Write a protein that binds this ligand. Structure first.
Ligand SMILES: *[C@@H]1O[C@H](CO)[C@@H](O[C@@H]2O[C@H](CO)[C@@H](O[C@@H]3O[C@H](CO)[C@@H](O)[C@H](O)[C@H]3NC(C)=O)[C@H](O)[C@H]2NC(C)=O)[C@H](O)[C@H]1NC(C)=O
Ligand SMILES: *[C@@H]1O[C@H](CO)[C@@H](O[C@@H]2O[C@H](CO)[C@@H](O)[C@H](O)[C@H]2NC(C)=O)[C@H](O)[C@H]1NC(C)=O
Ligand SMILES: *[C@@H]1O[C@H](CO)[C@@H](O[C@@H]2O[C@H](CO)[C@@H](O)[C@H](O)[C@H]2NC(C)=O)[C@H](O)[C@H]1NC(C)=O
Ligand SMILES: *[C@@H]1O[C@H](CO)[C@@H](O[C@@H]2O[C@H](CO)[C@@H](O)[C@H](O)[C@H]2NC(C)=O)[C@H](O)[C@H]1NC(C)=O
Ligand SMILES: *[C@@H]1O[C@H](CO)[C@@H](O)[C@H](O)[C@H]1NC(C)=O
Ligand SMILES: *[C@@H]1O[C@H](CO)[C@@H](O)[C@H](O)[C@H]1NC(C)=O
Ligand SMILES: *[C@@H]1O[C@H](CO)[C@@H](O)[C@H](O)[C@H]1NC(C)=O
Ligand SMILES: *[C@@H]1O[C@H](CO)[C@@H](O)[C@H](O)[C@H]1NC(C)=O
Ligand SMILES: *[C@@H]1O[C@H](CO)[C@@H](O)[C@H](O)[C@H]1NC(C)=O
Ligand SMILES: *[C@@H]1O[C@H](CO)[C@@H](O)[C@H](O)[C@H]1NC(C)=O
Ligand SMILES: *[C@@H]1O[C@H](CO)[C@@H](O)[C@H](O)[C@H]1NC(C)=O
Ligand SMILES: *[C@@H]1O[C@H](CO)[C@@H](O)[C@H](O)[C@H]1NC(C)=O
Lengths: 324, 171, 324, 173, 174, 324
């Protein structure tokens, strides 16, 4: 008659690491780190992301004529921009504070496109014929759909033109404008005229004034001229006054802007956007797991596990496996 | 530290005990068999479940890097952002990886202590009514039926009941 | 005859959490986290804080005419700014590098108000009548107390005025100035005159020159015009040369600045300031404790416990309590 | 791991022992009573105080957020600062909360080991002169007066002194 | 955490045992001598080495501060950078200093457990054939030559072999 | 006959700290922290660092005439700048984006000096005589070696001058230019001429324009005039067009820039550079160790141990030392 005290053992070959010993076989353990992903984009909270397709984010929001599919109301959970989108800033020049603009839009949830200043706003000038071969639509020359390139009338001089918008809505307005810089004096006099020219924007809280900087530049997209693009936010209740006697790239269409109540994201990726659901969406793909860590990506939207460099984080729950 | 039981004076485990982590093997006229210790197994499961959940619960936050961009004249704040993100990445990687090493040691030792305490719980009961073989087994100096065996597992072994019979087996 | 070995037990019902078991009753323990606060502001190091009251921080330092209560030397342990202060930059326009200015003053300990350029500095001109309804004091028009709005004499031209200040003191000098942009040519010619006008400031390390950018802007406080406000630090040993033939909002009173040898704070809060002392002052209130952590606020001045999110951090010191 | 003593083979604590964490209860002709073992209790107090002080001392720095402000064209560095402040906040929240859990376990286990060690120290002394009941108690095979009890508590118990009387009560039964 | 052996019921160490951390001292007709238990010692050495290496391996990253400069109009991001660099410094100092305190306790307790376990291993073998002095020593109730001593150390001690002689030397005494 | 179980002891007096007890003697232990340094600078990856000697980093890269020793091809592992170098920006003025320039150079490994625009580029103007006593070479007046100061001829007016550089190489080009700001209008008309003057630079990705900002300033290095210094990177394949009608400080010599593929460093230190090799180089000196932590400096370039505040980090490896 006898009784023995002992412990469980099985065919487990799963190992864990300890501080005193590595590769230790245990009876039961749990993996805390997730390394698997669906290389694609899904919906967050049943709301689809915005595909910018063959347009860069500047080209979309400025209204590059080749971005027509995107020229409408848009609602996104997050934004996907493609690495080598052809359609961006077609007419050469720098968008001022570009990075802050992308950051703002990333914090956005919805935009509503509307006509801020119709062509009839500007009197004494040519609101047509403001197109360029650098911004083609089809074969013919064209221009941005959110901007109006104004040149003087051939019969008359370029007068002081003015525009005013009272923002009476509850939503902030994202609008754009520009200043054209011809390469030589001849073009300046031909399009706008001699003497001192100016572009002046003003709101209750914003003050903007620039002059033409005529200078010879290397050709970009067949253009030795440049346009300095600018953006700003018309606060609700605020009013914008536009005043210029030349070189004005006028705001035409603008957006009613809706701020996202949480962090938004802009992913730079070639992954496909599909009609699927995800809780965790990384820039490298979807993660479906109950695990506590992932080694997939630090950039994500939604609810994801913590990012670490580890290949594995396995906690022992069971006992040291010692079969007979 | 090691408690000397698991892979110690009890040299190996039992693949025959499938209903628990810790337990007994008995032999008498009514047969033999494995039986898991009901008390200590559940308590160990509750503790380890709590440990795993607590660890998960404390790791239940995330440092969220962003995809903000920087110009060529923003090299400093660009790098500032990078060293911060890499900084927290290295901290949490350190925290997770080290926690696993240290606590796996504790988890294995916890079982070791549970096995030792279970053995001592029995050894304390049987006293001189049984012969300690030193390997986790006890040979009885008396007949120990299924109910007797059962009492040992229950922790209610009646020592003076079998005391006379055990002592009265001196050859 | 017998002897037993045992352990302490008492009437404690205080619980702690362990990695293996929650709500564990122990005989003795110590709480490390503090969650109590006095919702008020007290003095730090026997020095009272500066309450800006119904004035914003720009309104105080520029000398908004309705901020007379603050019109003096100021010494603070920290600064309390009120959420809905009415009196700030009364005349519409942008203060350049506003945020860096607040950061600088926040790092300050004391300012000494003094007269930098007395009205006699500027000759041939009208140093009175530089007021606006946009900066009212009572019903009548007024202006900032640290700035001098100089307009031409009606009888005369606006001559070139000049000013010079050598900072021979040991403290840096915080001073302000501005450039006025009248809305129409009429006001420009009337206040300063036609032709090219300029505002020129210069030190050993700073070079400033601007011209008026006349433009019609939306009305703020009845004003279509703007003032471009500027601030700077005149280093000790440096010298300031002021030169202008128009549109100059001249420095009048300025500040000798005292650097705080430690971290300073500016709290935006509605809490009442009382006659009390504190070692730890947070933006949410006073904390009086020897505990190592607090649950109150990450923004504070003085000696405070570390801020964490925890509701409780209780270390077990005694043993598991098992009464009989 | 558990050392099997506290809430173990010694099932409960004593509300009658108010002058120490660990100690003795005796019974003899001169009555009964509790007496705390001052040596082991004091040693534990010294360690736990040191543990608490060391933990506080390592927590004796602070990450200080500031109230600096940012313009609408400074959204990125605003967010950088917020993610940093929240970042260090999450690290120290983790460190404190996890350290408390782990060390509370160690503290409770420490007391368990101290009680276990104290029990073995006595058991080593009495040897077969006393009967180990398995519940932390020892029935003496001989008469053990107040002086005898004190010697057990003092750790200076004279084993061969009581040996014969002890064996002459094992042979009597 | 203490296992009661080191600076416990085994009151002191042996400066005479120079070839290992844990071990034996025996006495018989053939003399005395120290002998380290190579098995338990080597196992501890592998473990402690492993512990030290693992710690070094996890500390094998660095937060690298830079010498970037900031203008007098860049006070905020200057301070931002300073609070960050100082921030990670305080985190790693905390991690390093606290880890040394906590694991030093564990390492010292580990040795204590190893000495305890080795002692129990002997006590389990000898059973009632030897007299437990309570100080880590065992007086044999029988003659134990070098070959007998080795078996105790070898873990191959033959208990029933010496049972009769041993039990036949407890009643002679008393 | 007896056998005893025991543990090792030795003559160790080395102590470690535990959570329960301080000043504890142990038989074996290891120190993890390194606190010793060689107070000197050595070579990293067998490449010597660049000593700036008596020149500041701006003085070197702008080509201050007293920095002649450094004006050549340079390849460095890191840079050593001396605290009180006298030779920096000799002619008074501000270097635009100075800190970003230093950050750029710090991430660099090699520069190749070459002549970008020869003096013959600018015709109709005086390309000689562009020197100043504030920038002496030897005893006589001079000017930067990478910049060309152009003033008008008295015989003719100052024409619109132009320059072009095609970057057809594979290396980026770091180049400099400036705008001169005379203290008074007289000097402006004498050096450049009346009317509106401008300096305009442009590439495929950059658009630059400034005008003279005449203002009365204190004398610095005997000069009351100022130069606004600017820098930029001409990308490979890009082209720079220079166009100005006055006040132009032209690029003369420039650098082909090579980006370091890892972290670079600029140390501000008085330490000697010697003929030695190092794996770890901190700003406070060389560290030779296998230890995991150091007490020396957070600023370093090679492969260094982690920096902490600790005086000592000693792990116990051995046992509690209890000799009899
Ligand atoms: C575990 O410990 C045992 C105790 O010492 C070792 O076994 C004994 O000692 C010797 C070593 O094996 C053997 O010696 C041989 O046999 C007799 C002694 O009994 C001698 O006369 C012989 O000369 C000798 N052989 C030779 C080739 O000289 C003993 O036989 C043996 N005795 C018993 C009872 O086991 C074990 O070796 C040891 N195991 C190890 C070290 O792995
Ligand atoms: C995620 O969920 C799975 C399944 O619910 C968990 O895996 C199982 O957990 C139960 C509980 O211990 C076991 O019976 C199974 O054997 C487990 N399977 C495997 C493959 O481990 C898993 O533990 C969960 N993950 C986390 C981190 O909690
Ligand atoms: C097994 O053990 C339990 C206790 O752990 C026994 O239950 C006790 O029985 C006694 C009577 O003999 C009662 O006085 C106690 O109150 C009981 N304990 C409790 C907690 O209620 C049980 O009888 C034992 N034997 C079995 C189950 O066969
Ligand atoms: C622990 O050891 C330290 C040092 O070994 C001792 O305290 C200090 O001892 C030396 C004196 O030469 C120096 O480190 C310090 O000046 C001492 N501390 C002082 C003066 O505050 C002491 O033995 C222990 N530390 C204590 C008791 O705090
Ligand atoms: C795996 O386990 C089974 C029983 O579950 C048994 O065959 C044995 O333990 C293992 N298999 C083999 C082939 O040994
Ligand atoms: C454990 O396995 C790993 C596999 O990557 C490898 O380091 C080696 O085989 C083992 N490590 C040690 C220390 O034995
Ligand atoms: C338009 O702006 C004016 C500001 O002068 C405001 O009073 C008016 O109410 C606005 N129109 C609305 C809100 O319909
Ligand atoms: C018991 O309860 C109350 C308060 O908890 C009080 O009588 C006393 O302080 C407590 N403790 C003791 C030891 O009496
Ligand atoms: C005890 O029970 C649970 C913990 O898991 C919780 O709901 C409860 O609040 C705990 N007690 C206290 C006082 O928090
Ligand atoms: C905090 O202070 C109280 C009274 O000032 C004191 O009794 C208590 O022990 C202190 N706690 C700590 C952890 O120092
Ligand atoms: C320990 O002993 C060695 C023996 O070589 C001796 O040289 C040394 O001075 C002693 N003390 C220390 C601290 O090493
Ligand atoms: C010179 O620059 C021109 C400007 O567009 C361009 O064609 C090319 O990059 C350069 N020419 C050659 C032959 O490399």
């Amino acid at each position: 008659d006898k009784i023995c005290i002992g412990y469980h053992a099985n065919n487990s070959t799963t190992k864990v690491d300890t501080i005193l010993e590595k590769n230790v076989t245990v009876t039961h353990s749990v993996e805390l780190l997730e390394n698997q992903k669906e290389e694609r984009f899904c919906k967050i909270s049943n709301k689809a992301p915005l595909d910018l397709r063959d347009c860069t984010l500047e080209g979309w929001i400025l209204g590059n004529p080749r971005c027509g599919i995107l020229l409408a109301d848009q609602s996104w959970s997050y934004i996907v921009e493609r690495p080598n989108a052809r359609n961006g800033i077609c007419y050469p020049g720098t968008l001022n504070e570009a990075e802050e603009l992308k950051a703002l839009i990333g914090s956005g949830e919805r935009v509503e496109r509307f006509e801020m200043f119709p062509k009839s706003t500007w009197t004494g000038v040519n609101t047509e014929s403001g197109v360029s071969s650098a911004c083609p639509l089809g074969n013919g020359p064209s221009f941005y759909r959110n901007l109006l390139w104004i040149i003087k009338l051939k019969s008359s001089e370029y007068p002081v033109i003015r525009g005013t918008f009272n923002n009476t809505g509850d939503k902030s307005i994202l609008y754009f404008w520009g200043v054209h810089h011809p390469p030589v004096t001849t073009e300046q006099n031909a399009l706008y005229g001699s003497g001192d020219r100016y572009v002046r924007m003003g709101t209750e809280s914003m003050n903007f004034a620039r002059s033409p900087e005529i200078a010879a530049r290397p050709a970009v997209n067949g253009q030795r001229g440049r346009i300095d693009y600018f953006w700003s936010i018309l606060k609700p209740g605020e009013t914008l006054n536009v005043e210029s006697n030349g070189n004005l790239i006028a705001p035409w269409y603008a957006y009613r802007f809706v701020n996202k109540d949480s962090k938004g994201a802009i992913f730079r990726s070639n992954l496909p956007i599909e009609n699927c659901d995800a809780t965790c969406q990384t820039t490298e793909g979807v993660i479906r797991t109950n695990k506590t860590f992932q080694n997939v990506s630090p950039l994500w939207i939604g609810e994801c596990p913590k990012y670490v460099k580890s290949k594995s984080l396995r906690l022992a729950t069971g006992l040291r496996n010692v079969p007979q | 530290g090691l408690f000397g039981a698991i892979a110690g004076f009890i040299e190996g485990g039992w693949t025959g005990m499938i209903d628990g982590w810790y337990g007994y093997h008995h032999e008498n006229s009514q047969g033999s068999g494995y039986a898991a210790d009901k008390e200590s197994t559940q308590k160990a499961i509750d503790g380890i479940t709590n440990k795993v959940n607590s660890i998960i619960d404390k790791m239940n936050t995330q440092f969220e890097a962003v995809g903000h961009e920087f110009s060529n004249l923003e090299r400093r704040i660009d790098n500032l952002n990078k060293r911060m993100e890499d900084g927290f990445l290295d901290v949490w990687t350190y925290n997770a990886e080290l926690l696993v090493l240290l606590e796996n040691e504790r988890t294995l030792d916890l079982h070791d202590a549970n096995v030792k305490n279970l053995h001592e719980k029995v050894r304390s009961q049987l006293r001189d009514n049984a012969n300690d073989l030193g390997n986790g087994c006890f040979e009885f100096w008396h007949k120990c039926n299924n109910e007797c065996m059962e009492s040992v597992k229950n922790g209610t072994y009646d020592y003076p009941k079998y005391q006379k019979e055990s002592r009265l087996n001196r050859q």
